[PDB]
Amino acid sequence: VQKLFVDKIREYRTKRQTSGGPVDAGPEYQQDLDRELFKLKQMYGKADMNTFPNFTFEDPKFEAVEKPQS
Amino acid sequence: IDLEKSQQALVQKRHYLFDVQRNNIAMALEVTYRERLHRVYKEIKNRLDYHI
């Protein structure tokens, strides 16, 4: 069916004329890609784009031992 | 003999507690060293992991 071989490539080239993502999204693709974009961040964490690690650690304080001896 | 050897073996017990103190604080300071590096090593992947 090479007449069908040409007819699924030629209506693939029409999909390669794109402006803003989906062609017939409407309220469908706008809600779904925003529902999924939250879920990759919801149970994952709150993370910005480029912020480095900012913290500070304190070690164990070295106490002394009192000892009258001999 | 015992009162001489009571002070003899005591000062070998006094120096044991200073070998143990000198390596414990040297190591407990060192355990926080790479753990400071680990969390920055952790965080530089997580901002990469969120984008990919």
TrEMBL record, chain B:
Protein's cellular compartments: Mitochondrion; Mitochondrion inner membrane
Superkingdom field: Eukaryota
Function text: Subunit b, of the mitochondrial membrane ATP synthase complex (F(1)F(0) ATP synthase or Complex V) that produces ATP from ADP in the presence of a proton gradient across the membrane which is generated by electron transport complexes of the respiratory chain. ATP synthase complex consist of a soluble F(1) head domain - the catalytic core - and a membrane F(1) domain - the membrane proton channel. These two domains are linked by a central stalk rotating inside the F(1) region and a stationary peripheral stalk.
Similarity comment: family membership: Belongs to the eukaryotic ATPase B chain family.
Subunit structure: F-type ATPases have 2 components, CF(1) - the catalytic core - and CF(0) - the membrane proton channel. CF(1) and CF(0) have multiple subunits.
Protein name as catalogued: ATP synthase subunit b
Protein source organism: Sus scrofa (Pig)
Gene from which this protein is expressed: ATP5PB
Portion of the parent chain present: 150 to 201 of 256
